[PDB]
Design a protein around this ligand. Structure first.
Ligand SMILES: CCC[C@@H](C(=O)NCCc1ccc(O)cc1)[N+]1=C([O-])[C@@H]2Cc3ccccc3CN2C(=O)[C@@H]1Cc1ccc(O)cc1
Ligand SMILES: CCC[C@@H](C(=O)NCCc1ccc(O)cc1)[N+]1=C([O-])[C@@H]2Cc3ccccc3CN2C(=O)[C@@H]1Cc1ccc(O)cc1
Ligand SMILES: O=P(O)(O)OC[C@H]1O[C@](O)(CO)[C@@H](O)[C@@H]1O
Ligand SMILES: O=P(O)(O)OC[C@H]1O[C@](O)(CO)[C@@H](O)[C@@H]1O
Ligand SMILES: [Mg+2]
Ligand SMILES: [Mg+2]
Ligand SMILES: [Mg+2]
Ligand SMILES: [Mg+2]
Lengths: 328, 328
């Protein structure tokens, strides 16, 4: 019929679903935040920090840092949606308990800004989120954050790259929305997205070679030296999970972040990094595993618990799991 | 002292220069070209393409691609400068001779948009440019663009990443200007840029391992298994040269793209990819070699001649060079 906007989409769901509305309000809030973060990432108005209007010689570099500004934007915007009671963020040691006068029936685990190491060099970065409906009637507490990804109602991420895109995964599938920064609307460009069965790119940090387990080690040799004499896979690794996963989703292949010396249980976080992306991958028709068990079925025991993950096209991930059994 | 916009910076170089004012007009052009491309890259107005105003009878004129657009912006904006006579673009099979009624004395080699494999996945991309002064004194010809990079008077790139940055290198140094997209000005944010002596990140597509020469193989192995038992280098490889070289510049380290079987003499182009980055690296106090000789010393015989390239921290690059030496 005609163009579809995130606002419209999040609403059509609301009609169909016939619910309190909370989720639709929560998702609109999210959007409003991703737009603010995006404009800040692109550094709009930076001339004002460098004294274009002067500064009466009194502006020590005490500007709130992008990483911190993102958290503030997400907390406050979600807290104004009236759809949440518990919020977990990478930037906060404890789960944030929402004021009673504004609480809702949802729990959100998020990474306001992922790709920290790439921040100063201008590489793509992003915001990650997974949403859970409360699972009991006890007074709100971190407890509600420890629900397995298997119980996610919605998940996704915002990629601030060459352009800004919001990928949202819900029970019925995955959709990609492109931010039109000129009017501030996320336009739907890819509907019910599905990952490729087998890709041709593998992504992982090889500087950890000396610490890889026998399975990872074997797998890598295969991509470079195909036992069946097939074309070796190309290698890509941005260093920003949102960016690597996003490419995995749209181009195919596999992305790996396993255990190594300093990261026995892996590095990536379960609540706000592994789970959202795993849900996104599965909802898009791909796999996401620790190498041994599926990421969504893990029962988190701490809000900043780390987990090893491997995700991407089915066959690519299957083959690596194949190798893991071989070594078991 | 106060804010410095690239425009202010380019006008003052000129004053000192005491010349025709042509370089200034040229850099002005480039800037305008860069800002428009950045705006296109970020997808402003995309709502219109998706019917926000209804059927726009758009047909035969299949929408214009970012790559074609960018080239057209750069080709047009440069001609308007009245400061050039020969343009070499990756997108053009032949050097563009500027019509007589618009001829300036400069030759420019550029890549309107680099990292084309990262376009559809929203990964950082950029524009690379290298500028020359007409060597001869006879009718403008492709030959004029066939000069070693040592002859460059100005070179750099516009990186369309999380934020847009234009890096400009000239005889007296390298300067970084952040694009404030709200007013269309580039703000100098890092003056007299120097790369670090030793890094801790290497950047190469290992999917070609099977085809690497013995030196690359040895050096790579040494990065993961530091014979000095120190911490191994972290790995990063975005896939877009600009993003990758840019990271190298601000964090230090080493970027590589040697020759492989399908790429007998490397993949990257000497004129609009390698030379400009080689130039930036040397002005920043870093090195750039093919493995046998300095990139800038090479004399071109084909405007689309490719070449292998190793750039970054001098210590890391020299380490690799001594390995080539040893294996000789
Ligand atoms: C895009 C950033 C805008 C930013 C700003 O810093 N402007 C200063 C000049 C400038 C403009 C663009 C740019 O890229 C760099 C510097 N800004 C505004 O322009 C207007 C000003 C204003 C004045 C009165 C009442 C409300 C507002 C709203 N309003 C804003 O809320 C912000 C912040 C602001 C507000 C008041 C000021 O005196 C200076 C800045
Ligand atoms: C940021 C895109 C701007 C772009 C556009 O696509 N506008 C359509 C509406 C829209 C707005 C925002 C958006 O994100 C998507 C679609 N645009 C303008 O808004 C104004 C319109 C105009 C009208 C009369 C005379 C001059 C201009 C200049 N002018 C422009 O040159 C461009 C292109 C344009 C011009 C005239 C039109 O009828 C439609 C589009
Ligand atoms: O440098 P490393 O150990 O490869 O870490 C990479 C990862 O770090 C993260 O920033 C998370 O901390 C991810 O976004 C990225 O995948
Ligand atoms: O797929 P490859 O072999 O890594 O090619 C990547 C290189 O090619 C380019 O896209 C140029 O064609 C560079 O931006 C990049 O580094
Ligand atoms: Mg973070
Ligand atoms: Mg993160
Ligand atoms: Mg190009
Ligand atoms: Mg290129």
């Amino acid at each position: 019929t005609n163009i579809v906007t995130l606002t419209r989409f999040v609403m059509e769901e609301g009609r169909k679903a016939r619910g309190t509305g909370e989720m639709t309000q929560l998702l609109n809030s999210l959007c409003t935040a991703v737009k603010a973060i995006s404009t800040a990432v692109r550094k709009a108005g930076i001339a004002h920090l460098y004294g274009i209007a002067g500064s009466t010689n009194v502006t020590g570099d005490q500007v709130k840092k992008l990483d911190v500004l993102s958290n503030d934007l997400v907390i406050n915007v979600l807290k104004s949606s009236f759809a949440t009671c518990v919020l977990v963020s990478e930037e906060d040691k404890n789960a944030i308990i929402v004021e009673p006068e504004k609480r809702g029936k949802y729990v959100v685990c998020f990474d306001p800004l992922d790709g920290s190491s790439n921040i100063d060099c201008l590489v793509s970065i992003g915001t990650i989120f997974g949403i859970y409906r409360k699972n009991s009637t006890d007074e709100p507490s971190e407890k509600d954050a420890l629900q397995p990804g298997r119980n996610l109602v919605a998940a996704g991420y915002a990629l601030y790259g060459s352009a800004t895109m919001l990928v949202l995964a819900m029970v019925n599938g995955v959709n990609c929305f492109m931010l039109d920064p000129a009017i501030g609307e996320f336009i739907l460009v890819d509907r019910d997205v599905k990952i490729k069965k087998k890709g041709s790119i593998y992504s992982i940090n090889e500087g950890y070679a000396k610490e890889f387990d026998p399975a990872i080690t074997e797998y890598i040799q295969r991509k470079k030296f195909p036992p069946d004499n097939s074309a070796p896979y190309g290698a890509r690794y941005v260093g920003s999970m949102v960016a690597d996963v996003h490419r995995t989703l749209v181009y195919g292949g596999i992305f790996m972040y396993p255990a190594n010396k300093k990261s026995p249980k892996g590095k990536l976080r379960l609540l706000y990094e592994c789970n959202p992306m795993a849900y996104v991958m599965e909802k898009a028709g791909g796999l996401a595993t620790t190498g041994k068990e599926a990421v969504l079925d893990i029962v988190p025991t701490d809000i900043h618990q780390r987990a090893p993950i491997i995700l991407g096209s089915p066959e690519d991930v299957t083959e690596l799991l194949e190798i893991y059994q071989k070594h078991a």
